[PDB]
């Protein structure tokens, strides 16, 4: 196949230069399991039990006894397949643009297929990481004109039925108020029997800068970051706490455990960018190629994620 | 919309840590207290009479009798469960007492409740005594724990 | 069936895509092994 | 099990005395397929193709070509479970009712378990045969107060999308008019490529008495039955034309091929009566037992059944 | 199932079956149309005829009042048979194509009613009278409607010279895109029926 | 719904080949060229077999297509994917020939899209190539060829 | 696994029901074998 | 030069089409060989 198709050989020879996604740090090795799908859904069933009333006292003779009820919940995860198209130079036409240093027309912004694929794959991986973090797909800084996505497709930040805290605009710079909100959210967290697990916190650069200020009169050898780590260690059975900074987040703090029993990422095995066989050819030197990627597959238990939003308005 | 089991799927797994106030759901079929000597009859369902009082409805004669949501002097029993595949409603006759959650018209413990034309309980013939206050599950769905003791003026 | 393996000779584009997926999975495993936290 | 449960041993020893259903005569050996399901449904998918427009002439240059469309159909068969209860005498109480001629109580109509089960099973088999023939479940001779069954549960007589003819009330005694209606129905019959197959006709005794009349002043060589057989042989490629009489039908004629490709009966493997393990036992000598049986499973192709009803008003 | 998409093999098989059905309909009726009313027909080139629309042939019409009168239908068939002009090619097998309703009318005993004699047998004897006691085959087709077609099976009188590519043949061109849906093409050739004049009898039973 | 969700009770008879295309499940056009431009848009409601118009929200979400016509006509919806909620649109610049929903008409009549994306007799948008075919009590289809917008 | 077989001994009611079904199937098969129209 | 022969390995689409035509002709010949018309 490589002898006949040049594009496949170039993709195979340049796939190594593509960097690994940064979203891998946000999850433990056991928290990610690949699934075989491109567009569809995966469903699971969970069984719960509940008490209908107070117990019945067994005295003398009795026939009417209190009942215990059962319920089922079906959880569905949806997947979506998306495509991008990019223009590049033809393999036969490369020799007429192979300058001494650079290869490709600077004036016309035309590139060889290998470099174009590398850059496009990097951009698509950035978009995928942004989707996995925020739960939205957009290419605007303001966050408008978002792509309408299928239901049951959520990220860590927009996950519903989780603990949500809001720091007011007046208390935007008050790390004490921010920590009060974080403490309230941590108290409202419900880990159950899975408490003994490592915890992960993701913060914006501004929050990271505010963390290193001395804990408040100013304390000695005690900082807000250390206080937060101790507070989280109080609830996670003194397990490891990993703090990360992400430029994608903005005035948002995300706290969640690293246990597969609570949060699990089951992405499609074709989620990462993959080239398409179809190549648009013409009589000119410009050709077109396509890249496919799959989105969706984050599953979380209810009331296990703390999301703190600092209103900056 | 009104079916016992919601057709819409749930996006997330439930948190099975608490054990309190986890039974006031519409899927809770049957009764809170049930005896082994209770009489229950399956009947063809006309419409959706689940968790409502039922009355006997007769057709032209080609098909058998069925049960439809209703009350008043025509009340025949209380629908406690439904199988959608067969369209079969399980009814406890008015001759047998029942204790469970029933649909209430859109109320304090000790109030007297009677079934209306739509098979919904309403404050006052007296058919049941409310054992709790109205619990809202939807903008129009209100349930209530009641004890039915047949017919009496 | 991975692109890292030099002995891999893709017969068809389907095998090439499967090898791409396997290479991605192996890269994820390698990154998690190398990570020290 | 036979050394502990007396009722099971009685069922085993009496099961061989129950007559086989008469519905077997209405189907070929390969037209019946047992399925493993008590209550529920089974789905099948069929694909079909159709032409969208007139053919496009290939002359000079053209890229707009006529298209061919495809369509899928899903057919669902429903299987329902039904139960009867019957009262009999307890095993230990038989000796107190044994007589010289019979065992039981004539005055109170109480029977041993074996005889009661045999009679009940015979009645249930009669009901099952009636259901398979007519498509309705009722106990009244008039046919009213029918049991409201599930959709996609049909019999030979009430099968929709088939050829239906109605002989007028004034022509009920006119065999010429009846046979004209039969001719019209047979002409409207559509066997397709499966025409070379045996045919089956089911008639009522009055219809048979009218058939055995001489063909019509009146030819003394052949009969109306012979004319009908020749007419059906004209359309089944001169194959066997079996004729049966059923007391269940009343002034109705059923014609259908004995080909599995067109009509197939896929009954449940538990369709025939089966005893239950629940036996009601009290302090008296009377006990109760339960019998289960499954209904549904007739699949037919469109316009492959002729149903002639002779209005008797 | 939701979007009505099939594998290539199944799609090609179904398309070929439909195209062969259309080709058979064209060979019989001499027209190409997808409507059951025979309207909005495709305009074809001249000198393209079928067994039913061939010009300069013998045509008979049974009236509305005699729609169910097999005696009148047989009278019209006899008139057409007499008007036939087989000539020196008379000693040849004959072929009759009939609709199912008229076939059911034929299978009745010949009319009191003659014992062991049917209308079909009488028709076979009548045709054998003119074909020098040769085989007379009778076939039924659902495509015909209230039509009876009688013609010899002699290559000298009627000859079918179809193209060697008349039956469906796949095309090398396959439309492809970045999606999973592709397109394929099937070609077929129509035309090629030759018949001598006044050698085909076409009987139409006018219904109502 | 393009595909009848309710299951059929009997197998169909695949013997005839005539008048087997006048169905609502028929997607696309009777004559399709390999050089036709096809787009996919988010679906607002059910615009299948109806003219679509571009609708912009408050800016938080991207534009979508809704059943409509008049001066706001943007294209014609010929197919829909229900799982993804995606409507296939042929732009009004591209010409289309196929079966479209008709307001509840003879060949040669000039038809224009109404506010609900239904064709109606008279700027003209298409020419009726056949008569109205009734599929349901209120569902009527008609074969029409769209050649853009012209007064 | 049929009631006709004397050596067969049903352990439980489930085996008894399966044997009843198998016996019914065998009876139908025998009827079709011995049927002459 | 027919699709019936397993040893036949077409080189190009023209040979494939010729093989299809030959196979159709052979099928017609076989059908006429196996045809048994009813003469009554």
Short mmCIF file of N, CA and C in Angstrom, two decimals, chain D residues 130-250:
data_model
loop_
_atom_site.label_atom_id
_atom_site.label_comp_id
_atom_site.label_asym_id
_atom_site.label_seq_id
_atom_site.Cartn_x
_atom_site.Cartn_y
_atom_site.Cartn_z
N UNK D 130 -58.50 -23.05 17.46
CA UNK D 130 -59.41 -22.00 17.03
C UNK D 130 -58.68 -20.68 16.83
N UNK D 131 -57.76 -20.35 17.73
CA UNK D 131 -56.99 -19.11 17.59
C UNK D 131 -56.12 -19.14 16.34
N UNK D 132 -55.43 -20.26 16.10
CA UNK D 132 -54.58 -20.37 14.92
C UNK D 132 -55.40 -20.25 13.65
N UNK D 133 -56.62 -20.79 13.64
CA UNK D 133 -57.42 -20.74 12.43
C UNK D 133 -58.02 -19.36 12.20
N UNK D 134 -58.70 -18.80 13.20
CA UNK D 134 -59.52 -17.61 13.00
C UNK D 134 -58.84 -16.30 13.36
N UNK D 135 -57.81 -16.32 14.21
CA UNK D 135 -57.18 -15.09 14.64
C UNK D 135 -57.86 -14.38 15.79
N UNK D 136 -58.89 -14.98 16.39
CA UNK D 136 -59.58 -14.40 17.53
C UNK D 136 -59.62 -15.40 18.68
N UNK D 137 -59.77 -14.87 19.89
CA UNK D 137 -59.88 -15.67 21.10
C UNK D 137 -61.21 -15.32 21.76
N UNK D 138 -62.12 -16.29 21.80
CA UNK D 138 -63.42 -16.09 22.43
C UNK D 138 -63.99 -17.44 22.82
N UNK D 139 -64.94 -17.42 23.75
CA UNK D 139 -65.62 -18.63 24.20
C UNK D 139 -67.09 -18.66 23.80
N UNK D 140 -67.66 -17.54 23.38
CA UNK D 140 -69.06 -17.51 22.96
C UNK D 140 -69.20 -18.02 21.54
N UNK D 141 -70.27 -18.80 21.30
CA UNK D 141 -70.53 -19.31 19.96
C UNK D 141 -70.80 -18.18 18.98
N UNK D 142 -71.41 -17.08 19.45
CA UNK D 142 -71.62 -15.92 18.58
C UNK D 142 -70.29 -15.32 18.14
N UNK D 143 -69.31 -15.28 19.03
CA UNK D 143 -68.02 -14.71 18.73
C UNK D 143 -67.77 -13.34 19.32
N UNK D 144 -68.68 -12.83 20.15
CA UNK D 144 -68.50 -11.53 20.79
C UNK D 144 -67.71 -11.69 22.08
N UNK D 145 -67.52 -10.58 22.79
CA UNK D 145 -66.75 -10.54 24.04
C UNK D 145 -65.35 -11.13 23.83
N UNK D 146 -64.73 -10.75 22.73
CA UNK D 146 -63.41 -11.27 22.39
C UNK D 146 -62.35 -10.72 23.33
N UNK D 147 -61.28 -11.49 23.51
CA UNK D 147 -60.15 -11.07 24.31
C UNK D 147 -59.32 -10.06 23.53
N UNK D 148 -59.10 -8.88 24.11
CA UNK D 148 -58.30 -7.85 23.47
C UNK D 148 -56.85 -8.29 23.44
N UNK D 149 -56.37 -8.70 22.27
CA UNK D 149 -55.01 -9.19 22.13
C UNK D 149 -54.07 -8.08 21.67
N UNK D 150 -52.78 -8.40 21.65
CA UNK D 150 -51.76 -7.45 21.25
C UNK D 150 -51.72 -7.31 19.73
N UNK D 151 -51.22 -6.19 19.23
CA UNK D 151 -51.05 -6.05 17.78
C UNK D 151 -50.00 -7.01 17.25
N UNK D 152 -50.01 -7.17 15.92
CA UNK D 152 -49.14 -8.13 15.23
C UNK D 152 -49.40 -9.56 15.68
N UNK D 153 -50.65 -9.85 16.06
CA UNK D 153 -51.08 -11.19 16.45
C UNK D 153 -52.29 -11.52 15.58
N UNK D 154 -52.07 -12.26 14.50
CA UNK D 154 -53.09 -12.49 13.50
C UNK D 154 -53.16 -13.97 13.15
N UNK D 155 -54.32 -14.38 12.64
CA UNK D 155 -54.53 -15.71 12.13
C UNK D 155 -54.73 -15.72 10.62
N UNK D 156 -55.00 -16.92 10.10
CA UNK D 156 -55.20 -17.07 8.67
C UNK D 156 -56.44 -16.31 8.20
N UNK D 157 -57.52 -16.35 8.97
CA UNK D 157 -58.78 -15.76 8.53
C UNK D 157 -58.74 -14.24 8.59
N UNK D 158 -58.16 -13.68 9.66
CA UNK D 158 -58.18 -12.24 9.89
C UNK D 158 -56.89 -11.55 9.45
N UNK D 159 -56.05 -12.23 8.69
CA UNK D 159 -54.79 -11.64 8.25
C UNK D 159 -55.06 -10.47 7.31
N UNK D 160 -54.50 -9.29 7.57
CA UNK D 160 -54.74 -8.14 6.69
C UNK D 160 -53.85 -8.20 5.45
N UNK D 161 -54.12 -7.27 4.54
CA UNK D 161 -53.37 -7.14 3.28
C UNK D 161 -53.39 -8.44 2.48
N UNK D 162 -54.55 -9.10 2.45
CA UNK D 162 -54.75 -10.32 1.68
C UNK D 162 -56.00 -10.16 0.82
N UNK D 163 -56.18 -11.08 -0.11
CA UNK D 163 -57.31 -11.02 -1.03
C UNK D 163 -58.57 -11.45 -0.27
N UNK D 164 -59.59 -10.59 -0.28
CA UNK D 164 -60.83 -10.84 0.43
C UNK D 164 -62.00 -10.67 -0.53
N UNK D 165 -62.87 -11.68 -0.56
CA UNK D 165 -64.06 -11.66 -1.39
C UNK D 165 -65.29 -11.90 -0.53
N UNK D 166 -66.41 -11.28 -0.93
CA UNK D 166 -67.66 -11.36 -0.18
C UNK D 166 -68.77 -11.79 -1.13
N UNK D 167 -69.27 -13.01 -0.94
CA UNK D 167 -70.41 -13.49 -1.69
C UNK D 167 -71.68 -12.90 -1.09
N UNK D 168 -72.51 -12.30 -1.94
CA UNK D 168 -73.66 -11.54 -1.47
C UNK D 168 -74.67 -12.45 -0.76
N UNK D 169 -75.52 -11.82 0.05
CA UNK D 169 -76.52 -12.56 0.82
C UNK D 169 -77.51 -13.26 -0.10
N UNK D 170 -77.95 -12.58 -1.16
CA UNK D 170 -78.89 -13.19 -2.09
C UNK D 170 -78.30 -14.32 -2.91
N UNK D 171 -76.97 -14.39 -3.02
CA UNK D 171 -76.29 -15.43 -3.78
C UNK D 171 -75.61 -16.45 -2.87
N UNK D 172 -76.07 -16.59 -1.63
CA UNK D 172 -75.46 -17.55 -0.72
C UNK D 172 -75.65 -18.99 -1.20
N UNK D 173 -76.80 -19.29 -1.79
CA UNK D 173 -77.07 -20.63 -2.31
C UNK D 173 -76.62 -20.81 -3.75
N UNK D 174 -76.13 -19.76 -4.40
CA UNK D 174 -75.73 -19.83 -5.80
C UNK D 174 -74.25 -20.19 -5.88
N UNK D 175 -73.99 -21.49 -6.09
CA UNK D 175 -72.62 -21.96 -6.20
C UNK D 175 -71.90 -21.33 -7.39
N UNK D 176 -72.64 -20.99 -8.45
CA UNK D 176 -72.00 -20.31 -9.58
C UNK D 176 -71.44 -18.95 -9.17
N UNK D 177 -72.22 -18.18 -8.40
CA UNK D 177 -71.73 -16.90 -7.91
C UNK D 177 -70.57 -17.08 -6.93
N UNK D 178 -70.67 -18.08 -6.05
CA UNK D 178 -69.59 -18.34 -5.11
C UNK D 178 -68.30 -18.67 -5.86
N UNK D 179 -68.39 -19.52 -6.89
CA UNK D 179 -67.21 -19.90 -7.64
C UNK D 179 -66.70 -18.75 -8.50
N UNK D 180 -67.58 -17.85 -8.95
CA UNK D 180 -67.13 -16.64 -9.62
C UNK D 180 -66.30 -15.77 -8.68
N UNK D 181 -66.76 -15.62 -7.44
CA UNK D 181 -65.98 -14.87 -6.46
C UNK D 181 -64.64 -15.56 -6.19
N UNK D 182 -64.64 -16.89 -6.11
CA UNK D 182 -63.39 -17.63 -5.92
C UNK D 182 -62.46 -17.41 -7.10
N UNK D 183 -63.00 -17.40 -8.32
CA UNK D 183 -62.19 -17.13 -9.50
C UNK D 183 -61.57 -15.74 -9.44
N UNK D 184 -62.36 -14.74 -9.05
CA UNK D 184 -61.83 -13.38 -8.95
C UNK D 184 -60.71 -13.31 -7.92
N UNK D 185 -60.92 -13.94 -6.76
CA UNK D 185 -59.88 -13.95 -5.74
C UNK D 185 -58.62 -14.66 -6.19
N UNK D 186 -58.77 -15.79 -6.88
CA UNK D 186 -57.61 -16.53 -7.37
C UNK D 186 -56.86 -15.74 -8.43
N UNK D 187 -57.58 -15.02 -9.28
CA UNK D 187 -56.93 -14.16 -10.27
C UNK D 187 -56.16 -13.03 -9.59
N UNK D 188 -56.75 -12.43 -8.54
CA UNK D 188 -56.04 -11.39 -7.80
C UNK D 188 -54.92 -11.94 -6.93
N UNK D 189 -54.87 -13.25 -6.71
CA UNK D 189 -53.77 -13.85 -5.96
C UNK D 189 -52.44 -13.61 -6.68
N UNK D 190 -51.39 -13.40 -5.89
CA UNK D 190 -50.05 -13.12 -6.41
C UNK D 190 -49.06 -14.06 -5.74
N UNK D 191 -48.70 -15.14 -6.43
CA UNK D 191 -47.73 -16.10 -5.90
C UNK D 191 -46.30 -15.79 -6.31
N UNK D 192 -46.10 -15.03 -7.39
CA UNK D 192 -44.76 -14.70 -7.83
C UNK D 192 -44.01 -15.93 -8.32
N UNK D 193 -42.73 -16.00 -7.96
CA UNK D 193 -41.88 -17.11 -8.37
C UNK D 193 -42.12 -18.38 -7.55
N UNK D 194 -42.90 -18.30 -6.47
CA UNK D 194 -43.21 -19.45 -5.63
C UNK D 194 -44.55 -20.08 -5.99
N UNK D 195 -44.94 -20.00 -7.27
CA UNK D 195 -46.23 -20.55 -7.68
C UNK D 195 -46.22 -22.08 -7.68
N UNK D 196 -45.08 -22.69 -7.99
CA UNK D 196 -44.98 -24.15 -8.05
C UNK D 196 -44.89 -24.70 -6.63
N UNK D 197 -46.04 -24.74 -5.97
CA UNK D 197 -46.14 -25.23 -4.60
C UNK D 197 -47.54 -25.77 -4.38
N UNK D 198 -47.70 -26.75 -3.49
CA UNK D 198 -49.05 -27.26 -3.19
C UNK D 198 -49.92 -26.19 -2.55
N UNK D 199 -51.22 -26.31 -2.77
CA UNK D 199 -52.20 -25.38 -2.24
C UNK D 199 -53.09 -26.08 -1.22
N UNK D 200 -53.62 -25.29 -0.28
CA UNK D 200 -54.50 -25.80 0.76
C UNK D 200 -55.76 -24.95 0.81
N UNK D 201 -56.91 -25.62 0.83
CA UNK D 201 -58.21 -24.98 0.92
C UNK D 201 -58.94 -25.54 2.13
N UNK D 202 -59.53 -24.65 2.92
CA UNK D 202 -60.30 -25.01 4.10
C UNK D 202 -61.72 -24.48 3.92
N UNK D 203 -62.70 -25.36 4.07
CA UNK D 203 -64.10 -25.03 3.83
C UNK D 203 -64.94 -25.55 4.99
N UNK D 204 -66.15 -25.00 5.11
CA UNK D 204 -67.15 -25.46 6.06
C UNK D 204 -67.95 -26.62 5.48
N UNK D 205 -68.59 -27.43 6.33
CA UNK D 205 -69.36 -28.58 5.80
C UNK D 205 -70.46 -28.19 4.84
N UNK D 206 -71.14 -27.06 5.06
CA UNK D 206 -72.15 -26.62 4.10
C UNK D 206 -71.52 -26.30 2.75
N UNK D 207 -70.36 -25.66 2.76
CA UNK D 207 -69.65 -25.39 1.51
C UNK D 207 -69.25 -26.69 0.82
N UNK D 208 -68.81 -27.69 1.59
CA UNK D 208 -68.46 -28.98 1.00
C UNK D 208 -69.68 -29.65 0.38
N UNK D 209 -70.83 -29.59 1.07
CA UNK D 209 -72.06 -30.15 0.53
C UNK D 209 -72.45 -29.46 -0.77
N UNK D 210 -72.29 -28.14 -0.83
CA UNK D 210 -72.55 -27.43 -2.08
C UNK D 210 -71.54 -27.80 -3.17
N UNK D 211 -70.28 -28.03 -2.78
CA UNK D 211 -69.25 -28.39 -3.75
C UNK D 211 -69.53 -29.74 -4.40
N UNK D 212 -69.97 -30.72 -3.61
CA UNK D 212 -70.12 -32.08 -4.13
C UNK D 212 -71.35 -32.18 -5.03
N UNK D 213 -72.07 -31.07 -5.20
CA UNK D 213 -73.14 -31.03 -6.18
C UNK D 213 -72.55 -31.08 -7.59
N UNK D 214 -73.30 -31.60 -8.56
CA UNK D 214 -72.78 -31.66 -9.93
C UNK D 214 -72.56 -30.28 -10.52
N UNK D 215 -71.54 -30.18 -11.37
CA UNK D 215 -71.21 -28.91 -12.01
C UNK D 215 -72.32 -28.49 -12.96
N UNK D 216 -72.64 -27.20 -12.94
CA UNK D 216 -73.68 -26.65 -13.82
C UNK D 216 -73.18 -25.41 -14.55
N UNK D 217 -78.27 -29.14 -19.03
CA UNK D 217 -78.36 -28.14 -17.97
C UNK D 217 -77.18 -28.27 -17.01
N UNK D 218 -77.12 -29.40 -16.31
CA UNK D 218 -76.06 -29.68 -15.35
C UNK D 218 -75.20 -30.83 -15.85
N UNK D 219 -73.89 -30.62 -15.90
CA UNK D 219 -72.98 -31.66 -16.35
C UNK D 219 -72.91 -32.78 -15.32
N UNK D 220 -73.00 -34.02 -15.80
CA UNK D 220 -72.94 -35.20 -14.95
C UNK D 220 -71.56 -35.84 -14.91
N UNK D 221 -70.56 -35.21 -15.53
CA UNK D 221 -69.22 -35.77 -15.58
C UNK D 221 -68.36 -35.33 -14.40
N UNK D 222 -68.23 -34.02 -14.19
CA UNK D 222 -67.39 -33.48 -13.14
C UNK D 222 -68.23 -32.66 -12.16
N UNK D 223 -67.65 -32.41 -10.99
CA UNK D 223 -68.31 -31.70 -9.91
C UNK D 223 -67.68 -30.33 -9.70
N UNK D 224 -68.36 -29.51 -8.90
CA UNK D 224 -67.82 -28.20 -8.55
C UNK D 224 -66.47 -28.34 -7.85
N UNK D 225 -66.30 -29.39 -7.05
CA UNK D 225 -65.01 -29.64 -6.41
C UNK D 225 -63.93 -29.88 -7.46
N UNK D 226 -64.24 -30.68 -8.48
CA UNK D 226 -63.26 -30.94 -9.54
C UNK D 226 -62.94 -29.67 -10.31
N UNK D 227 -63.95 -28.84 -10.59
CA UNK D 227 -63.71 -27.58 -11.29
C UNK D 227 -62.80 -26.68 -10.46
N UNK D 228 -63.05 -26.61 -9.15
CA UNK D 228 -62.21 -25.80 -8.27
C UNK D 228 -60.78 -26.33 -8.23
N UNK D 229 -60.62 -27.65 -8.18
CA UNK D 229 -59.28 -28.24 -8.16
C UNK D 229 -58.53 -27.91 -9.44
N UNK D 230 -59.21 -28.01 -10.59
CA UNK D 230 -58.56 -27.65 -11.85
C UNK D 230 -58.20 -26.17 -11.89
N UNK D 231 -59.08 -25.31 -11.37
CA UNK D 231 -58.81 -23.88 -11.35
C UNK D 231 -57.58 -23.56 -10.50
N UNK D 232 -57.46 -24.21 -9.34
CA UNK D 232 -56.29 -23.97 -8.48
C UNK D 232 -55.03 -24.58 -9.09
N UNK D 233 -55.18 -25.70 -9.81
CA UNK D 233 -54.04 -26.31 -10.49
C UNK D 233 -53.55 -25.46 -11.64
N UNK D 234 -54.43 -24.63 -12.21
CA UNK D 234 -54.00 -23.71 -13.26
C UNK D 234 -53.02 -22.66 -12.73
N UNK D 235 -53.10 -22.33 -11.44
CA UNK D 235 -52.25 -21.28 -10.87
C UNK D 235 -51.11 -21.81 -10.02
N UNK D 236 -51.17 -23.07 -9.58
CA UNK D 236 -50.07 -23.62 -8.78
C UNK D 236 -49.14 -24.52 -9.58
N UNK D 237 -49.15 -24.39 -10.91
CA UNK D 237 -48.33 -25.21 -11.81
C UNK D 237 -48.67 -26.70 -11.65
N UNK D 238 -49.97 -27.00 -11.60
CA UNK D 238 -50.47 -28.37 -11.54
C UNK D 238 -49.87 -29.14 -10.36
N UNK D 239 -49.93 -28.53 -9.19
CA UNK D 239 -49.48 -29.15 -7.95
C UNK D 239 -50.68 -29.68 -7.17
N UNK D 240 -50.39 -30.36 -6.07
CA UNK D 240 -51.45 -30.92 -5.23
C UNK D 240 -52.30 -29.81 -4.63
N UNK D 241 -53.61 -30.05 -4.59
CA UNK D 241 -54.57 -29.10 -4.03
C UNK D 241 -55.32 -29.85 -2.93
N UNK D 242 -54.85 -29.71 -1.69
CA UNK D 242 -55.49 -30.39 -0.57
C UNK D 242 -56.71 -29.60 -0.11
N UNK D 243 -57.78 -30.33 0.21
CA UNK D 243 -59.04 -29.75 0.65
C UNK D 243 -59.39 -30.33 2.01
N UNK D 244 -59.73 -29.46 2.96
CA UNK D 244 -60.06 -29.86 4.31
C UNK D 244 -61.34 -29.18 4.76
N UNK D 245 -62.06 -29.85 5.65
CA UNK D 245 -63.29 -29.33 6.24
C UNK D 245 -63.08 -29.10 7.73
N UNK D 246 -63.48 -27.92 8.20
CA UNK D 246 -63.33 -27.54 9.60
C UNK D 246 -64.65 -27.01 10.12
N UNK D 247 -65.09 -27.55 11.26
CA UNK D 247 -66.32 -27.08 11.88
C UNK D 247 -66.17 -25.70 12.49
N UNK D 248 -64.94 -25.25 12.75
CA UNK D 248 -64.73 -23.93 13.33
C UNK D 248 -65.19 -22.83 12.38
N UNK D 249 -64.88 -22.97 11.09
CA UNK D 249 -65.31 -21.98 10.11
C UNK D 249 -66.81 -22.07 9.86
N UNK D 250 -67.39 -20.93 9.49
CA UNK D 250 -68.82 -20.84 9.20
C UNK D 250 -69.00 -19.98 7.95
#
